[PDB]
Structures are given as C-alpha cells and as structure tokens.
C-alpha cells in the first residue's frame, strides 16, 4: 500500500532533501549525479517490507577531527541553500588535514539492518585537494559478508545537475551481532542513518 511522489526509491532511502509505487521517471532522484550500485536487487529486496524503522547508527555530532557540516552542494538544494542527503554525511577536511577514519558499528538490534554509504569521484586533482587534502585516497568497508575497498576515479565527466564529478552509493544488510568496519582517508560518504528490517 506504500506510495512515493517525485522521489525515486534511491532519492528516498538516501534522503533527498526535496522530500510497490513510484513514477517510472521521478523529478527528485540523486541530487549529486552518480550510480546507486546494486539498485534493482535492492528493489527486489524491498517488496518484502514487513518492518522498516529508520534508526541512527553514527551521530553526525561524533565527527570531531573532520568537517561534517560542509558536505553541501549547489545541486542538492533546500530552501535556497546548498544541502545534501539527510541519511548520509559528506565528510570534508578540517584545518587543511584529513586523518584516516576508523569507525565501526555492531548491530545489536535483534534485526537485519539496511546500511547505505558512498564514494565521491571528484573531477580533478583540484577538487580532490580542496575537499580532502590527500591526493591518494581509498575507502574500506567490511563485515563478515562483505569486503569492499574502493579507489576514487578522478575524472571530469559531462555536467549533470551542475556537477562534473559523480557519487557512487552502496548498500548492505547487516545481520544481528555482525559488525561493519569503515576505514577511509577521503572521498567517503559516511552513513548516519540506517534502516531496520
């Protein structure tokens, strides 16, 4: 009985700020342009929605040595300010430094949990240094079910929504008592909100 608007499923779960049944081509989608990795498999997983509670997993407040409130763009707008997806966090350098990040979450919620994060493919050595300082970055996400480790593809792609870089988003199911580990020295789109199942 569940019905969307001019959000897509993606724009929905990531929490586009301009926000069964969706319109085959929605207005609001991915603010920043990119791909939502494993899209359709997720969609198949989501017609079986018996329980769906959004819960926090890593407070935005808890980022002391990176600049949290700055991941905003003239491409994800809200009330004529630059904004971004609510559920994730676009971490930017602070005092011209970007210490590697080592975060980790244990699912102690009796339930499966749907976690969403991403990587920013910036478009040149310029944007890269400006935003994250480190020229050569990685991202490393892991559980007992998943092992991802991704390098950012620095290239200037065709401008879409004002933006010559891209953002890839990934997702995973976290079983009860499994932990997920993040490690990243730049270009990380960090989860803040996840979903119960």
């Amino acid at each position: 009985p569940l019905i969307l608007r001019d959000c897509s499923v993606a724009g929905w779960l990531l929490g586009n700020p301009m926000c069964i049944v969706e319109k085959a081509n929605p207005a609001n989608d991915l603010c920043y342009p990119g791909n939502f990795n494993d899209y359709e498999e997720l969609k198949h997983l989501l017609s079986r929605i018996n329980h769906f509670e959004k819960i926090q997993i890593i407070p935005k407040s808890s980022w002391s040595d990176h600049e949290a409130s700055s991941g905003v763009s003239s491409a994800c707008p809200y009330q004529g300010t630059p904004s971004f997806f609510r559920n994730v966090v676009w971490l930017i350098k602070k005092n011209n430094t970007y210490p590697t990040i080592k975060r980790s979450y244990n699912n102690t919620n009796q339930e499966d949990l749907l976690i969403l994060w991403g990587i920013h493919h910036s478009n040149d050595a310029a944007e890269q240094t400006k935003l994250y300082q480190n020229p050569t970055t990685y991202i490393s996400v892991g559980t007992s079910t998943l092992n991802q480790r991704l390098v950012p593809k620095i290239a200037t792609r065709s401008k879409v929504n004002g933006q010559s870089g891209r953002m890839d988003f990934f997702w995973t199911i976290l079983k009860p008592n499994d932990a997920i580990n993040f490690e990243s020295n730049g270009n990380f789109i960090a989860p803040e909100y996840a979903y119960k199942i």
Epitope: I55, Q56, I57, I58, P59, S61, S62, S64, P99, T100, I101, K102, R103, S104, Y105, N106, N107, T108, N109, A179, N181
Partner: antibody
C-alpha cells in the same frame, strides 16, 4: 588485554621523565590507549589518547603543551613524557584501554574504559 | 563538560541501600559509566551505557538515567561495596569524570 606500567618515580623540578605502559601487543581492532592522572584525594583527569597502530594522538585541551604521548610500535609500548616536571605533576598515572570509534545499538558509543594499568606513582618535591 | 556527583560522603549501615547521583552540565545522552575504586588500586568498571552492568557485577548494583540525572543504586550493602564511586562520560573527548563519592560503613 592486560596493561602493565613501569615502576614508581621520584624526581625534582626541571627533570625529564618518561613513564611507560605495555601489555596490548595484539588487539582487534581500532583501540585507544589513554592516559589518566589522579591527584592525591582528587577525582580523575583524562590527559590524552593514542592509537598504537597508526600512531594517531589526541591531547586534552588541558595538557596539549605540558606532556607528550608516544608509541614505539616496534616493542608495542606507549610512553608518557614530560620535559620539565613540576611539584604540581605529583600523582598516580594510569593508562587505560578502550575501543576506537566503535558504536552500536542506536548510535550510542563503545568508549568506556575496559581495562586499566596498576598505576605509576610520580612524585616531585623536591 | 562537567559532571557533578552527589553526595561526596555518605554513611550507610550494612544491609541497607545507597543512592549515588551524578548530573551532567550538557547532554551526554546515556554515554556514561560508573567505576569503583579502592585505595592503591585502579578503578574497575561497574556500569556502562548508564544502565548495563559489566560482567561479574551482581544485580544489586542498578543504574538509571533521566536525560541528565544519572543514578547509581546499591542495595543490600555487603562490605565488598564500600569504596569510592566515580561517574565518567564518554559522549565525547576530553572524557570527564565526577569528583567522587566515598561510601562509608555505618555503625
């Protein structure tokens, strides 16, 4: 883990002092070793913390200048160091183990001190 | 951040019930622990997340929170329980503690 610290020290103002703390040669993973100071009779004071792995260090806004936390990842031991001690610095010094950046439940932190060292008494009179 | 513990000294018969308080200046939102210290010794964890007991800890040590009012409760005092009780917040660094509450035997 089981933290052991170096023995007790007596020194005079203006002397260098480096106390030590080992006992964590393997952990997994992401963990902080912190330094806590406890003055005779008073409560307790967090001084700073270090990741023995990538030697990342946070100092308290009360101690950034006075002291220096350090690690020789070789022998897997953490050091607290002063350049010029002071009668004020007279205290019990503990090191303590906790997890680096682990979270759980609904956003709460896994950052309580799990394991302590026995203590290192430092005295400056002099 | 400031944790204010209360009281500092508390005289209580063996058998009875003690109620230690700790109050936060800000919000620590349940990221708070209780340790116990005895003379010469390090502190040992009793309570984490304001409510959960550590392993080994009996059920007569209880912990509850009202936002910023944190409450430790010891019932049926055995001699093993007379020492100093600190609260600590690990909501963010610099981690801060209380000033202590010495639990005295009453006769």
């Amino acid at each position: 883990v089981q933290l052991v610290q170096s023995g007790a020290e007596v020194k005079k103002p203006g002397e260098s002092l480096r106390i030590s703390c080992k006992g964590f040669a393997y952990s997994s993973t992401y963990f902080w070793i912190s330094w806590v100071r406890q003055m005779p009779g008073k409560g307790l004071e967090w001084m700073g913390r270090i990741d023995p792995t990538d030697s990342y260090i946070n100092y308290s806004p009360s101690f950034q200048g006075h002291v220096t936390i350090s690690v020789d990842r070789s022998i897997s031991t953490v050091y607290l160091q002063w350049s010029s001690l002071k009668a004020s610095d007279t205290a019990m010094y503990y090191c303590a183990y906790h997890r680096r950046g682990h979270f759980y439940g609904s956003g709460s932190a896994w950052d309580w001190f799990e394991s302590w060292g026995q203590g290192t008494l430092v005295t400056v009179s002099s | 951040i400031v944790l204010t513990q209360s009281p500092l000294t508390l005289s209580v018969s063996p058998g009875e019930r003690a109620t230690l308080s700790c109050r936060a200046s800000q919000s620590v939102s349940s990221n708070l622990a209780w340790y116990q210290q005895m003379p010469g010794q390090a502190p040992r964890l009793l309570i984490y997340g304001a409510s959960t007991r550590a392993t080994g800890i009996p059920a007569r040590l209880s912990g509850s929170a009202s936002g910023t009012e944190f409450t430790l409760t010891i019932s049926s005092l055995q001699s093993e329980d007379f020492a100093v009780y600190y609260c600590q917040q690990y909501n963010n660094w610099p981690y801060t503690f209380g000033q202590g509450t010495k639990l005295e035997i009453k006769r």
